[PDB]
Amino acid sequence: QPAAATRITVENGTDKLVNYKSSPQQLFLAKNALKDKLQGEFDKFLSDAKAFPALTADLQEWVDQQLFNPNQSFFDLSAPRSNFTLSSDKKASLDFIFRFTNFTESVQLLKLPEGVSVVVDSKQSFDYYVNASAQKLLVLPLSLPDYTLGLNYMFDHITLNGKVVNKFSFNPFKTNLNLAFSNVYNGVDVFEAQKNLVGKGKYLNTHVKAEDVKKDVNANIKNQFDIAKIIAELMGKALKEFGNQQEGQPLSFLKVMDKVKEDFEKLFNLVRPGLGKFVKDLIQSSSQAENKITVYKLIFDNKKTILNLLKELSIPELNSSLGLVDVLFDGITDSDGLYERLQSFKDLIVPAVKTNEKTAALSPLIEELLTQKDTYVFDLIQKHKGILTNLLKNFLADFQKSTPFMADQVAIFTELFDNEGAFDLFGEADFVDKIAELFLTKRTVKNGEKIETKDSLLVTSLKSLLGEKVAALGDLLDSYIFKNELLNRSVEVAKAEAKDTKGATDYKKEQAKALKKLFKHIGENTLSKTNLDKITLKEVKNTENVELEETETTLKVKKLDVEYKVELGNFEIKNGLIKAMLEFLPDTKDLETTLDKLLFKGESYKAMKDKYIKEGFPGYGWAKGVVPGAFESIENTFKSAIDKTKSIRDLFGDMLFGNDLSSVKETDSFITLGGSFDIKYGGENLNVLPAYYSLINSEIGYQIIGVDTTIDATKVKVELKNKEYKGKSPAINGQVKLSQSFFNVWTNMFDSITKQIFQKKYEFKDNIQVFARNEDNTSRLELDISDPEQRVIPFAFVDGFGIQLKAVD
Amino acid sequence: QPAAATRITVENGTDKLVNYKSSPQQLFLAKNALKDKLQGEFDKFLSDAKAFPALTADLQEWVDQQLFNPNQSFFDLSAPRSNFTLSSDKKASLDFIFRFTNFTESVQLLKLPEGVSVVVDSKQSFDYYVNASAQKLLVLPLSLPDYTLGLNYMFDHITLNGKVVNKFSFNPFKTNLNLAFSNVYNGVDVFEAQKNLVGKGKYLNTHVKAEDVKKDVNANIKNQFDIAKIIAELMGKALKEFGNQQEGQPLSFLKVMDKVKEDFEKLFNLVRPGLGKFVKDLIQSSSQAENKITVYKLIFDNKKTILNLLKELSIPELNSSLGLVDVLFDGITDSDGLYERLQSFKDLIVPAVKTNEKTAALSPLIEELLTQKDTYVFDLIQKHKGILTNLLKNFLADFQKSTPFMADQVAIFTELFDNEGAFDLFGEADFVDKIAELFLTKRTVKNGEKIETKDSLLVTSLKSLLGEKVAALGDLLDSYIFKNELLNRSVEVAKAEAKDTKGATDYKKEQAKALKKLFKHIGENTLSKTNLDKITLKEVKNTENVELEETETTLKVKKLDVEYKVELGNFEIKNGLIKAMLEFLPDTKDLETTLDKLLFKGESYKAMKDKYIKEGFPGYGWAKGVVPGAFESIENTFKSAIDKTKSIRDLFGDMLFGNDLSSVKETDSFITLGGSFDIKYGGENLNVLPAYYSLINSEIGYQIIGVDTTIDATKVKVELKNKEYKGKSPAINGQVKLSQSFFNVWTNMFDSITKQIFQKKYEFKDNIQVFARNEDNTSRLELDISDPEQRVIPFAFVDGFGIQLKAVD
């Protein structure tokens, strides 16, 4: 048999850390930091009610696995003498005597965790002595599957076989104490990592080459340009399908996604290597896709890509769910096996999800993720509208609280997703209609009495972006931009006064038609393959070697100087990119009243009117009756100039195009971009330092910080092809021609904008981070991710700022 | 024979006074004042080298005229004993013994200046004793023909016939001392007169009656109205003759004076009684008069009127020349005798005139006043141009220094009379042409290089009167009032560039024609007898008795209250009083350029133009190219409204008349005056005090001071008959009609003027001075002008302010 056991119980619980200094409330520290406090924290578990059962269980595991597991075939083990002295003084010790009794008639040897060479004859009671004086158990760390601080104990000086074994480890890599940390991880956070990762002949310096730096720097610009071009063609290949769709035939956001699915793959195989099959599979995982693929097929195939994307999420706690992914995917050859194993594990997965408050609302989702084998991501998204909208609203609110600079975009996004039906895009709907009824339609999202005056999303975005930049013409926006059924459809008012559905009354299809026309033009006239082909990113030098200097904990670029010329060719923005937007404006012929209100019936002209009526006209004085004959023809000629048959569409056509709208050809180019602009990535003595993912990962890149990315936008010509007024029937023609004057003002302001907002020799500085990947997804900078010294913890908090394991002190 | 004479020489000289206190340098004091200083001043003559011959001459005159003139027929006079003791102590005395020896054999009596009853037989030496102790000779005054202080001496206590004769006068009324005063006159100046002239039963109170006061007060208003009406008809009877004269036929200022001569008489027989023949004779004393009358005929006939007018002149010294007028006119029955006596007296008159510096320049004038018997006043005036212009300039300069309030009228008068040829009006000339070439013609009165830019008299008067009241429209006056050949004929420029005498070039007859047309209209349409007949001065109460209260040195009106209603009827100021003045303005069709300069090319509009061009247009801001399309039609419509064929005459016709000038009838009434205004001469306890002429005169009036002369101008209606625009071809017609607006402005401003400048219930206070004359020029208030107590000296200086007969002390 084996030795007697008394308290072999081993179950226990983990611990957690407390905030210190003025650090964020979410503490996710790494190892070190509490270098001295680890012993003190382990002493608490060493001197509590859970201490001696854990110690006895560890002793039992040691005396079975390490003592008689290679034995007991010919040597029975007994423990006649065995005692412990774990006292209240937090000082532990032991004294064990082991007898090996052999019943076989032969000569054998004892295998013990030491260089022991002892010969024992048959029927002989071999002696074994394990002595431990009263001493403080030392603390060493272990790496849990979650990469958390699994505190373990070791003996300092204990005698085995009568000799002292210095630095004795009591079955390392696993202890029956379960004293983990919920907020402290094994490894080096962000900066203790940049002590053994860079240097003279250390990891980063010997794994990053000058030719590699040059090729990655060039490929950074090349891939940025390529993804920009693929994005531009994508909206321009899907936009063409959107626009060309016939009226009354629904075309969902995802049915068109298939028609450009490969492009997405290309796009996402250039943003991140290996992320090519995942997105092309994702946009095919819907009922509207031509070839449906299940969620399990989506997940098992590109498991590694999903792992990288999850590790790129900002939330640390996801890594806790990421520790079982490798165990989840072990021994699986097809998606059916993965589905079966997830069904097997559901009995433990779903209670953990339900018990977690953060994922408590998520509980239904994962539910059918284990209930139906034909799950589709986008079908789930369109079916679980409420929960997904809730998380999206929370995430967007957090982003607003974190990104005040893009507050308008987050505001319009939140207003969009305030409606559950906004998730009907990812389903069986009409995108060219859903985007119109979400972004260009009044909202009534309330139930108290009525808040239907909430207007549309585009109108609110214009109000935010034109807050106070323009004031007098704001009334114009009130009469032509804020009060048009093509941008503010006025929900629930169509069936209020007509109740007969006239052709003009139904503005839901006229606005959809205008949006389809705009999509047609942006698709096959502006962002077409032919029009986007004349934008060439040509290398200029691309020859200089990017020498690297290494000296102690540093890695610098000697002289980075690469320049790429983006030649815009002749990017003809044809008439129709802005002619369709003109057609979005109402075609109401009532131009006299609106212009009269804007010019004369205002807040400043009326004050001058009154002041000149009561008194004024300096030098004259006594001629006060002349005044209501002076500011009456001044208004009269201006009013009479306005053509009775011209709307704001025609006025804006005169202002922008010059010639009248009916006489302006849609094939002509409104704006032509010619020439080229330079990109001048440069720098001297630029530091190169490791760049990690959001969570703990074995894949690492490198970043060059302080790269002067000069975008010299000069040498480009943004020319208005129609720089002269060719109109024959101007809206405000006459001796007080204002449409021509407005057109000249527009041309001058366009030249000013292209001189200041456009080319200005932009100067930027940032960090070029490249996570370069090899051919078969064997990225050059991959760490051992095994020993607790290269396990980087990017989300951890650095001890340099100051963290202590105590309650606010 | 008579008594022996030793120093009968009597010739001597006068004296003069010296300034004292802070009195004006021209001292012309009256008697009294130097009440105590007269004795001291006479002592100087009593103790000088001229004393004893004067005393001896006085003694001789006394002993011939008063002693033996009624004797020597039977009583020879001898002076065996005779001595004087006029010592250096200024104490005079005498001792005389007279023997009367009769050679006739009869009994006679001696006639002496005393109650002496003595009987002397024949051949008897009658004795006479005249004793005088050493005593100071007292001083008494005498009245010279010039009414100056003729100091005379008297003896206090001397014994005649053995008895003392108290207050002995040594031949009064004449002394051989000739100690006159050049600055002190006998009598009471202005206020010592109002001590014996008013009182309880003294002169003014007993010579002024309540009915007399009432009738004179009523006649004051009646005569003021009558002279105003006669003046208005006079220019309107002479103006008609001026206007109706044919072109090229000269009509002098005096040839027309005859055609209205009687009116002048009427006028001047209402301004001052008896001044009716003088002015009617004066304006007939010229070569241009139909019936010439000599200066002697003009002077001898109305000698009394000339005396009153000369006594009304402000200069005191003229009275010295007035002392011989009565002696001049003694024993003369016709103008021939007066001419003969002036020729006789010329040998003394002309040296006195020449020796006097003030009349030294006058010497030629009086010269022919005694050289030709056919002298004419106006022929002399037009012949002695230089001297008369010199005195007129000096008098006008003095009036300017004395009357700053009417400085503009004196300035234009001085500018007029700066030319000698300005006196050609009173001769053989053309008034309708001379007044045009003097008042509406440029002046070049200088010889240095050129001052021809002096402009005309009317232009300078407008510049003075429109100094800074209007500024912006001043440029209009520069282009239409300051630069018109009808008001600024531009002398010496007509024969500069043309040299061919075109019809338009000769502006001397076109301007004369315009002036003649204006005279025609003011003569027979506005100031005609028919039009002036409808202005009636009606008494309202004229019944209340003006009771007078007398109490010591006072005379007050108990309650003066008279009111006269001047009913203006319908005084039709026809079209032509202002239509002719419109025709004076140039008829140049260039109205666009002048109005453009006045309105747009100014000093304030251009600044606003520039400010709005550089920046501005509040609320818009970025629209700066619109501005040179905004302030271009604002000007363009205003410029295009102005009719190309309309001049400033037409614009002013639209502004004033309404309807166009060609369609405005000259017989219509531009302004009609209707209703009536009240004159409310009133007051309680109003002082009545004597009022004298400028110089010493026996004719006196009385003045009521403090009369509240309320001219309640209310209840009159000055109506514009054309208060609505009836024009069919306005100068600035269109949608920016400004001629109609200008006309409405003119109508409103006319109503405002007639509400404030016109009727306002004017309140005035003054002194009603009446020099009432009886039927045969026997004015009621005439003083004895004989005794040295009623001889008023109005020009004298009152001793109350302080005057002493010493050099500045």
Numbering used by the authors:
A (entry chain A), B (entry chain B): 60 to 868
Question: What do the paper's sentences say?
Answer:
The core domain resembles a half-opened left hand, with four contiguous antiparallel pairs of amphipathic α-helices corresponding to the four fingers and the N-terminal domain corresponding to the thumb. The dimer interface, which corresponds to the wrist, is composed of helices with a conserved tryptophan residue (Trp681) that interacts tightly with the neighboring monomer. The palm of the hand includes a long and well-defined central α-helix, namely the bridge helix (residues 268–304), and a rigid β-sheet of five antiparallel strands that extends to the N-terminal domain. The core domain forms a large cavity that measures 62 Å from the proximal to the distal end and 38 Å from the anterior to the posterior side. The cavity has a volume of ~18,000 Å3. The cavity is completely hydrophobic but is fully accessible to the solvent. For the inner part of the P116 core domain, the cryoEM maps show prominent elongated densities (with a length of 10–19 Å and a width of 4 Å) that fill most of the hydrophobic areas. Instead, the mass excess of ~13 kDa, consistently measured by multiple angle light scattering (MALS) and mass spectrometry for P116 in different preparations, could be explained by the presence of ligand molecules bound to P116.
